[PDB]
Amino acid sequence: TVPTNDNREQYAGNGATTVFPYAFRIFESSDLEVYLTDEDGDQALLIEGTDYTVSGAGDEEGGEITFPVSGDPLDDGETLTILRVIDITQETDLKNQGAYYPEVVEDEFDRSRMIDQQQQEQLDRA
């Protein structure tokens, strides 16, 4: 299920930290917009598997990300941000209905709620 409203975390590099555990479910590890703003304000996007490794994904209780793979731990000024931008597209079929797992309906409801959460978060900005 999706019992909590939390969908975004904002962590600041203390200088010697690489563990950034989050607290929301993730459908598949490829869906995590790991943002990094430098010590000016500019927005930069990093690539999964090059500068971080997420772990514990798929579990209902959040997970963990091992940013960075290499280099010094994030210093001050620069900021690392975690966003669960869920794909906004239906991808569950039901019309053919060979055997009809209930879990798929629950799962896709969860996806809808997560889409609404992410939206809410990006709506708060404007």
Binding site: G98, Y100, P102
Partner: protein, 826 residues
């Protein structure tokens, strides 16, 4: 190439659990038709496998931390009960409910110690039950009313006696002759353990007793005798000096018959004729009642002592066999209208059989009449204390060293013609033997082994074969505690491992089926097991230890029925209660005020006879018709019979106008679960699994309305098959991979499957997908037939499947089709 996947159908599971040591016997059919793990899945003669139905919680008995036991008792076929025995008490049960009397159970005070109750051996005859024990006086149990029960002692009139004291020196002198009499012996023989018994004193001879010459003159009080019979004159016909005896020899053993027709004989000029009251015929039993010393005892005389003991003193005394020091019968049975008791503590290897018809007497007569009492002594070799008598083709005696057979040769049962023969040397434990067909199942001595017993026209003697040969691992390092035989639904033998684990048989000798099955319950242990009639289904009753609330409670349990045409009627929870409300007793409902509408329509509901009250407003009522159903909410009270209801779904068209065959309210909060206080109980509502909720305060709240709810401890059931192997050029060494599985369920729902890897976890189970039509609000229906399910695959060498069902739904596996592709060897 294009080598397609292969199928290796396993038709049967009648092999049951196969011991790990047996896993190298691929050259036997058992390997082909067995299962490596069969937890909570009772095999079926036909070779299927169905998850065990849950144990319905009856109640707790008493004495949380004391021992307990159950036995089956019947009151003829009128009714059957279940006696419960604990520390110095006794209760009754029936239909999984206590025998209520004034809002309290019926209790019969007993003397059996808590540790000794398990060694109690019992029999039954119509309305009389008998309990025996070497350290306790036998107590026959009889029933006078469902609310009134009586437990009396066993009155052994002229009880069994040792052989007469051939020691001539020791003699016994009796002060009196009738009634309260004080005895005296020339040696220290008497004991204060003989407080109530039946000793015997027989005259040495008729010394100081006049004979019975044919024609003689006697006096008003005489003591003449003829043969083993001392008579006493009580009247004379003519004058005291003119009366003689006569020719009619005294032959009565009671009465005052004459011996002359009170008249003359030719010219003897006497009047003839004399009365002859019968007295002691040589012996008289004295029922001891008091103790004074080893040479001084007091008792009442059953008949009359001859005057010889009063004056001369006899030496032929026979002490009673049963007392409070030599022991009491340790086992009992019936035979040829005779009661047989056996295994006294001081004399173990002996059985005493009462006379024909008189079940509570042991009189033995001088002429040794055919129907007198019986006394034997099986000796052979080794200790052979008798523990079980069972009439199979004759009275069989199972002893600690041998399995005797008692027989009357070929003439009749009598003290002289009775014989005894050996059938083998294997022994038998104290566990009560079980009776199946023309065979007797008996625990082999020292536990750990189960042997059957029956005739065999190969050796002309009752003999049997082991039943634990294929599943010794389930019993080897354990000892059997109890037994039962629920022959009607499935010829299953329930037994308890002394670990608290319950195991089941599927014995059927006529069809050569011996299937074992390891069972278990969550947070519990089993203590004792018995089965009774219960209508048309043998219902086992079990004592289950549990750790509820950090205390070792003991509950009463009984296995539910596997009869359910709908999944909603199933029951797969341990110590679970039912809250069914499908009442249809003269209350047939019909929804009116419109037909086939879509809620918010002010639909009217009517009842045949009242069955509605204003307090019931706001409570939801389901209406059934065949399989289809509908739900409507009560909004207002129009009348005790007619009311207005608002639908919760469209009432199905085939469920309109026509009068619903049954109905019932739905509840959301369930009470009466204090016996499961603080447990992760599982729930099942209308054939749908509900999220577990911990019993808090004894109340469980449901997330929706539900007509039928079964709530109780969850059941874990596992099946995991043998590794694939074959004889000759084996394939066990070859790598194997299973990709799909065809199971062929019948009347089942919710099967999980996976590969039986070492690191197997519940998270990789793949469960079947079955919901095709399954109308809204209707639970997923039952499924019968072959269903093909795929599993994630590896390349292990075990090549074993694993079927699990942790939720309360029916499962029944008739076969297994493992989609198997062979690989290469090492």
């Amino acid at each position: 190439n294009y080598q397609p996947a292969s199928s290796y159908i396993q038709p049967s599971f009648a092999g049951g659990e196969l011991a790990p040591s047996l896993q190298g016997r691929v050259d036997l059919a058992r390997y082909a038709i067995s299962l490596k793990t069969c937890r909570n899945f009772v095999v079926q003669p036909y070779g299927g496998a169905s998850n065990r139905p849950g144990f319905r919680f009856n109640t707790a008995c008493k004495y949380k931390n004391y021992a307990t036991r159950l036995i089956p008792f019947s009151f003829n076929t009128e009714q059957t009960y279940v006696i419960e025995i604990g520390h110095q008490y006794m209760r009754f049960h029936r239909d999984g409910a206590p025998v209520l009397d004034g809002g309290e159970p019926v209790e019969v005070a007993t003397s059996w110690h808590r540790d000794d109750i398990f060694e109690i051996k019992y029999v039954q005859s119509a309305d009389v039950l008998t309990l025996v024990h070497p350290d306790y006086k036998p107590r026959q149990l009889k029933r006078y009313s469902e609310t009134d029960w009586v437990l009396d002692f066993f009155d052994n009139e002229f009880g069994p006696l040792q052989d007469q004291n051939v020691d001539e020196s020791i003699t016994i002198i009796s002060n009196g002759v009738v009634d309260l009499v004080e005895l005296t012996a020339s040696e220290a023989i008497f004991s204060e353990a003989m407080v109530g018994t039946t000793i015997k004193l027989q005259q040495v001879s008729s010394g100081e007793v006049a004979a019975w010459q044919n024609r003689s003159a006697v006096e008003q009080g005489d003591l003449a005798y003829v043969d083993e019979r001392t008579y006493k004159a009580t009247s004379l016909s003519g004058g005291v000096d003119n009366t003689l005896t006569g020719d009619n020899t005294p032959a009565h053993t009671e009465g005052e018959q004459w011996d002359g027709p009170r008249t003359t004989i030719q010219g003897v000029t006497e009047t003839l004729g004399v009365k002859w009251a019968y007295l002691h015929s040589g012996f008289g039993y004295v029922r001891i009642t008091e103790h004074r010393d080893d040479t001084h005892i007091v008792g009442r005389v059953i008949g009359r002592l001859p005057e010889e003991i009063r004056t001369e003193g006899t030496y032929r005394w026979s002490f009673a066999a049963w007392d409070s020091d030599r022991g009491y019968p340790g086992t009992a049975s019936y035979y040829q209208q005779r009661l047989v008791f056996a295994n006294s503590r001081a004399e173990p290897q002996a059985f005493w059989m009462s006379e024909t018809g008189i079940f509570n007497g042991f009189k033995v007569s001088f002429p040794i009449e055919a129907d007198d009492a019986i006394t034997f002594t099986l000796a052979s070799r080794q200790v052979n204390e008798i523990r079980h008598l069972i009439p199979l083709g004759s009275l069989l005696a199972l002893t600690s060293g041998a399995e005797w057979m008692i027989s009357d040769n070929d003439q009749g049962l009598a003290p002289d013609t009775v014989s005894a023969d050996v059938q083998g040397y294997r022994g038998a434990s104290d566990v009560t033997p079980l009776l199946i067909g023309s065979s007797a199942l008996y625990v082999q001595a020292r536990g750990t082994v189960i042997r059957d017993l029956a005739y065999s026209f190969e050796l002309d003697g009752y003999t049997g074969d082991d039943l634990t040969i294929f599943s010794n691992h389930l019993l080897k390092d354990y000892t059997i505690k109890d037994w039962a035989y629920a022959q009607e639904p499935d010829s299953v033998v329930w037994l308890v491992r002394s670990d608290g684990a319950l195991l089941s048989m599927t014995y059927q000798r006529e069809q050569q089926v011996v299937a074992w099955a390891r069972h278990d319950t969550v947070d519990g242990e089993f203590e004792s097991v018995a089965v009774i009639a219960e209508g048309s289904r043998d219902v086992p009753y079990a004592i289950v230890k549990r750790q509820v609330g950090g205390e070792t409670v003991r509950y009463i349990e009984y296995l539910d029925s596997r009869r359910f045409s709908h999944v909603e009627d199933f029951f797969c929870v341990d110590s679970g209660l039912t809250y069914d409300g499908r009442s249809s007793t003269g209350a047939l409902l019909t929804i009116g005020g419109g037909t086939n509408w879509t809620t918010d329509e002010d639909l009217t509901l009517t009842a045949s006879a009242s069955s509605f009250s204003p307090s019931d407003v706001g409570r939801r009522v389901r209406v059934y018709t065949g399989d289809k159903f509908a739900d409507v909410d009560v909004d207002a009270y129009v009348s005790a019979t007619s009311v207005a209801v608002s639908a919760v779904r469209i009432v199905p068209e085939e469920l309109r106008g026509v009068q619903g065959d049954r109905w019932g309210f739905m509840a959301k909060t369930l009470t009466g679960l204090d016996h499961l206080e603080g447990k992760t109980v599982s729930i099942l509502a209308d054939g749908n699994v509900h999220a577990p909720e911990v019993v808090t305060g004894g109340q469980v709240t449901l997330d929706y309305s539900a007509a039928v709810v079964h709530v109780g401890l969850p059941i874990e059931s596992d099946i995991e098959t043998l590794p694939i192997s074959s004889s000759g050029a084996t394939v066990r060494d070859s790598h194997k991979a299973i990709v799909g599985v065809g199971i062929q369920l019948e009347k089942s729902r919710g099967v999980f499957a996976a590969r039986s890897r070492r690191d197997f976890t519940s998270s990789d189970l793949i469960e079947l997908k079955q919901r095709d039509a399954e109308d809204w609000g209707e639970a997923t229906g039952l499924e019968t037939g072959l269903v093909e399910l795929g599993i994630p695959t590896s390349w292990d060498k075990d090549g074993s499947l694993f079927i699990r069902q942790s939720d309360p739904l029916p499962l029944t596996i008739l076969s297994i089709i493992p989609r198997v592709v062979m690989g290469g060897k090492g």
